[PDB]
Design a protein around this ligand. Structure first.
Ligand SMILES: [Zn+2]
Lengths: 61, 206, 314, 81, 180
RNA sequence: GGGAUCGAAGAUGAUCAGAUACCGUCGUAGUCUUAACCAUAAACUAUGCCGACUAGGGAUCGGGUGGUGUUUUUAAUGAC
């Protein structure tokens, strides 16, 4: 393609290209062995809100 | 007050953590020392994600008040925000501006881009400064996504979040669209998750 | 011989004689663009002899293997670092694997000083690329039907966890485990391949952290296919220069400094780079490439403020 | 910023201010009970003592003065009074 | 049978050297046939001659002079002229040799040489075909013997205090005489 | 009293040449010190002294407090 030029054979493709979505979400914990890797201070935050999540803790030190 | 059904759910919490929205990075301004939970030993600060939820609903209740939806303008010059605002303006009735803002769009009628918004939503108050400044000449209120380093002039509602990560930008716009459609009748119930996946809002490089 | 169809990488081809390799394998293969490209007139003679013997065979992989490999390399994330030429070697090696063994069942389907002298010059130049000219650097360790000799850790990394066979071309033994360096962001803990200029990128591509990428020691196993970082247990964090005063674009002070002449195209009312996708950043990266090419043929920038921003400059 | 409670400052923020600039002034020194290793006789010592306080029973010395807090000798035991 | 020169790099120049190292040794080892190594034990570089494959005695001096110019702070493509050409020299002096001046007088003086945006220094390097570096109080001038003197006698008048406008006029005169 | 160097005055060399147009040699008082005088400077931040309030950040110099911190060493101290 070139700047300053457009035609149907682009427009039809662009509307197809940007409708793409993966089969499984990038945010799904399935990609991360089913856990969230977090620091100690992050797990303190969760406890303050209540809730209960499958966290995993790294010391960071 | 809003009933308990508006409380932050555990499922949404997982989304916010997975997208790293709670990483506030460094160079904290003196305003927005609230919204900070604690500092790590390495120096990154943890944003209180509980307050992020509260403010996001408040912003949604402001957008839902506008009498007709095309009067809402969503702006993103930065490229990681562009697909997000385009999708936001498709599910809601809002009007998008992506790329160059062209100065004199709220002042200077006799311009092809001339508009009269009722509300402006900005993705980055430092990069989008031209749009914020010009709004102040004409009595327009402003909502902004803000990181802990953001300047604060003329922003009325700050939503505190990680403003740099590609997933963080997309996720926040996604949640706003869900909340406005659900304060309106367009989604029938707050208890059932929305069918659109978050990934539809993410930036796509190659 | 120990192996059938030992593929030789460009580095093995230059640094050793064919009489060295003849003990190792019954047949030898190379991508034609590799053998065509190499230039050393001292090597060319030794190379020419071995080519006229016909024991060194030039073969191009099929397009299906290239695509099949390419998708895998994206899953590990190394596809951004591997060159087109490097992919051809991986595709060539393990499409002969399909010929010499039935099926694909052996492989994983998806993841989970010193004097410089005019004789030594060519080796030293390769060392300054970061490639291992010595062999066995950091090595810690259906039968032998194919093996790959290569000196580039980026190719080795892909080979190991796909359960390919790597040949220590300095010694003639297969490599099971190796240690090298990769980047790790200390904010989000994600791991990234080390770029070929050998220093960190300014921004983390995942979380957008600025300057948080640190080089980290890493080990890789064929057995597990996993990747393990090695952390210094007594690390002391340095926080100098994390916080500083910076101008605001909408202050009355800023609007006075902006002046009456509109946008000045010289000395362009400079704005600091703070985001990856800030349009100011796009200019500097491409302009850096241009200045590199211009200066090198004719002879033939920093971002952020650094640690000491808070100390006054006269 | 514009609205804040000046009459009920938080305990943490109060603890870090200079001793003259808290809402009401007050000292931050204190007194110690001290025993030498030999005798049973307890004695009371000011935490910023300027003199070299001896024991009462004998001329063994308990502390030495410095620019700030006093340095207690080795072998002594103490309790904050 | 063997002869060598060792030369030392001061610390502020150390990093530029590392970033350029792969550019400077190929010209020495190929064109001059010297052998070289960087000895990081003592922050020095060493040039060594092998009698069996070297052309003439001038090679060893050219190599050292090329490296010497680099540590003074000349650009790499300015130093490289010392391998190619044969009659280039370096001259150096410091402002306290001309006039004793101490505080803000000292700072103003070197500002007067550079000029705004460096434009005054740039002018001198054009009317005389020479390169100039200012390293705080010390000046180094690289060029041909007669060109060096023309440069010196005009940088001197700036530190004696003459206004820049008067000096630009003199540069015009010198340039026309070179035309003749 | 002392008197190396530099050097108002003074005695001398050249008077040619427009970038280098003011240059070379010798040298008295002075420049240093002891005991007495004088009371000026663009003696400048060209901003009188004392006291309260409106403002925030991290660099540096001196002092003090805290830390399950690093190193010197098996404590104290020192350095960070
Ligand atoms: Zn990161």
């Amino acid at each position: 393609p070139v700047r300053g030029i457009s035609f149907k054979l682009q427009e039809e493709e662009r509307e197809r290209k940007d409708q793409y979505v993966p089969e499984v979400s990038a945010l799904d914990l399935s990609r991360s062995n089913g856990v969230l890797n977090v620091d100690n201070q992050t797990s303190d935050l969760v406890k303050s809100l209540g809730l209960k999540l499958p966290l995993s803790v790294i010391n960071v030190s | 007050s809003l009933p308990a059904t508006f409380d932050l759910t555990p499922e949404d919490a997982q989304l916010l953590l997975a997208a790293n929205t709670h990483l506030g990075a460094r160079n904290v301004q003196v305003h927005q020392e609230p919204y900070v939970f604690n500092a790590r030993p390495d120096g990154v600060h943890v944003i209180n994600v509980g307050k992020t939820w509260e403010k996001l609903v408040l912003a949604a209740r402001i957008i839902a008040a506008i009498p007709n939806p095309e009067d809402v303008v969503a702006i993103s010059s930065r490229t990681f925000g562009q697909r997000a605002v385009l999708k936001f303006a498709a599910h809601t009735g809002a009007t998008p501006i992506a790329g160059r803002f062209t100065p004199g769009s709220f002042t200077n009628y006799i311009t092809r881009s001339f508009k009269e918004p009722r509300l402006v939503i900005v993705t980055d108050p430092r990069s989008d400064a031209q749009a914020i400044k010009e709004a102040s000449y004409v009595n327009i209120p402003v909502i902004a996504l803000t990181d802990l380093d953001s300047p604060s002039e003329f922003v009325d509602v700050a939503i505190p979040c990680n403003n740099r990560g590609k997933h963080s930008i997309g996720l926040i716009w996604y949640l706003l669209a869900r909340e406005v459609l659900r304060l309106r009748g367009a989604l029938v119930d707050r208890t059932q998750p929305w069918s659109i996946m978050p990934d539809l809002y993410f930036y796509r490089d190659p | 011989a120990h192996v059938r169809a030992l593929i030789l990488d460009a580095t093995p081809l230059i640094t050793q004689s064919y009489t060295h390799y003849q003990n190792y394998a019954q047949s030898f293969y190379t991508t034609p663009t590799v053998f065509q490209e190499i230039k050393d007139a001292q090597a060319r003679k030794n190379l020419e002899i071995w080519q006229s013997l016909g024991t060194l065979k030039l073969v191009h992989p099929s397009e299906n293997s290239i695509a099949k490999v390419s998708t895998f390399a994206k899953l590990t994330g190394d596809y951004s670092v591997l060159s087109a030429n490097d992919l051809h070697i991986l595709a060539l090696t393990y499409e002969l694997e399909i010929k010499l063994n039935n099926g694909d069942w052996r492989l994983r389907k998806k993841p989970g000083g010193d004097w410089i002298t005019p004789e030594n010059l060519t080796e030293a130049i390769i060392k300054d690329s970061g490639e291992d000219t010595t062999g066995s650097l950091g090595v810690e360790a259906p039968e032998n039907q194919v093996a790959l000799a290569t000196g580039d850790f980026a190719v080795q990394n892909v080979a190991l966890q796909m359960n390919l066979n790597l040949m220590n071309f300095m010694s003639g033994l297969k490599i099971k485990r190796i240690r090298n360096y990769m980047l790790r962001c200390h904010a989000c803990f994600k791991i990234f391949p080390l770029p070929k200029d050998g220093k960190p990128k300014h921004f983390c591509a995942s979380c957008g952290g600025q300057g948080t990428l640190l080089r980290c020691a890493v080990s890789v196993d064929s057995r597990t296919g996993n990747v393990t970082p090695h952390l210094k247990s007594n690390f002391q964090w340095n926080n100098r220069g994390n916080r500083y005063s910076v101008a605001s674009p909408l202050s009355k002070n800023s609007q006075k400094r902006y002046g009456k002449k509109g946008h000045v195209h010289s000395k362009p009312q400079e704005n600091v780079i703070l985001r990856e996708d800030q349009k100011e950043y796009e200019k500097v990266i491409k302009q850096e490439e241009w200045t590199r090419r211009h200066n090198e043929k004719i002879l033939n920038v920093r971002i952020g403020k650094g640690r000491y921003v808070n100390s006054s400059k006269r | 910023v514009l609205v804040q409670d000046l009459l009920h400052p938080t305990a943490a923020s109060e603890a870090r201010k200079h001793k003259l600039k808290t809402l009401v002034q007050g000292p931050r020194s204190y007194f110690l009970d001290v025993k030498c290793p030999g005798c049973l006789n307890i004695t009371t010592v000011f935490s910023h003592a300027q003199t070299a306080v001896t024991c009462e029973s004998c001329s063994t010395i308990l502390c030495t003065p410095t620019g700030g807090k006093a340095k207690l000798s080795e072998g002594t035991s103490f309790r904050r009074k | 049978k063997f002869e060598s020169r060792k030369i030392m790099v001061p610390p502020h120049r150390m990093t530029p050297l590392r970033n350029s190292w792969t550019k400077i040794y190929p010209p020495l080892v190929e064109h001059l046939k010297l052998q070289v190594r960087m000895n990081l034990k003592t922050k020095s570089v060493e040039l060594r001659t092998n009698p069996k494959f070297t052309t003439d005695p001038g090679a060893l001096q050219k190599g050292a002079d090329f490296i010497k110019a680099f540590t003074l702070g000349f650009d790499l493509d300015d130093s490289i002229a010392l391998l190619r050409l044969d009659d280039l020299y370096i001259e150096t002096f410091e402002v306290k040799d001309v006039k004793t001046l101490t505080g803000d007088h000292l700072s103003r003086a070197i500002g007067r040489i550079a000029g705004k945006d460096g434009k005054t220094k740039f002018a001198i390097e054009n009317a005389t075909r020479t390169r100039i570096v200012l390293a705080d109080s010390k000046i180094h001038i690289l060029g041909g013997f007669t060109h060096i003197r023309m440069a010196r006698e005009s940088v001197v008048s700036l530190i004696l205090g003459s206004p820049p406008g008067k000096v630009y006029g003199n540069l015009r005169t010198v340039a026309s005489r070179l035309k003749e």
